[PDB]
Structure 1
Amino acid sequence: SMSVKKPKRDDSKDLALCSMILTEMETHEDAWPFLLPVNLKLVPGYKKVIKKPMDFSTIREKLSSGQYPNLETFALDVRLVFDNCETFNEDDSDIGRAGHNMRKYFEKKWTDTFK
């Protein structure tokens, strides 16, 4: 409350560390469905169904331009990429499996780096 604070967690490395995680996600062999925005002119149904499209290149640009206020808003966009994937793709598809694999990869790096 006013003039009453928990000890200050060092967040000075968070930007660099989120960048490193995102590089590892970018170079994973199953990243290909997520590298670029889904093409809303060429993929019937995507625009209407997926209210907030997200992809790794859009996260990279947001990260590089100071549009993440904190490390949690960064995690929320990464998770949005995988939630969107599950919304649109059957589990038994190459893309569906890719999304599960990448979400697991991310959540481990996230826990090991920050928890």
Structure 2
Amino acid sequence: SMSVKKPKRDDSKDLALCSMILTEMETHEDAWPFLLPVNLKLVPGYKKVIKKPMDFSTIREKLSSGQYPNLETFALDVRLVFDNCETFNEDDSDIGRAGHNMRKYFEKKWTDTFK
């Protein structure tokens, strides 16, 4: 409360560490469905069904231009990529499997790096 503060966690390296994690995501061999925005003109159903599209290149642009206020808003966008993927793709599809794999990959890096 007013003039009563918790000890200050060091957040000065958060931007650099998130960028490192995103680089490792971008270079994973199963990243290919997620590198660029889904083409809303060419993929039936995607625009109407998926209310907030998100992809690695969009996250990279937001990270490089100061659009994440903290490391949690960054994690929310990464998770959104995989939540969208589950919504639109069967678990037993190449893209469905890729999404499950990448989510597992991310959450381990997240825990090891910040928790």
TM-score by length of 1: 1.00
CA drift of 1:57 comes to 0.1
Distance 1:33 1:50 in 2: 15
CA drift of 1:39 comes to 0.1
SS at match of 2:34: coil
Distance 1:5 1:34 in 2: 40
Distance 2:40 2:77 in 1: 19
1:23-74 per-residue CA deviation (whole Å, 9 max, x = no partner) reads 0000000000000000000000000000000000000000000000000000
Distance 1:73 1:10 in 2: 17
Distance 1:89 1:65 in 2: 31
Which runs of structure 1 show a deviation greater than 6 angstroms over 4 or more consecutive aligned residues? none
Distance 2:92 2:65 in 1: 37
Task: Point out where structure 1 has 5 or more consecutive residues left out of the alignment.
Answer: none
SS at match of 1:30: coil
Identity, % of aligned positions? 100
SS at match of 1:97: helix
Distance 2:2 2:81 in 1: 37
Distance 1:114 1:74 in 2: 13
CA drift of 1:111 comes to 0.1
Task: Point out where structure 2 has 5 or more consecutive residues left out of the alignment.
Answer: none
Instruction: State the partner residue of 1:12.
Output: 12
Distance 1:61 1:8 in 2: 28
CA drift of 1:114 comes to 0.1
Instruction: State the partner residue of 2:77.
Output: 77
CA drift of 1:9 comes to 0.2
SS at match of 2:32: coil
Aligned residues: 115
Distance 1:61 1:5 in 2: 33
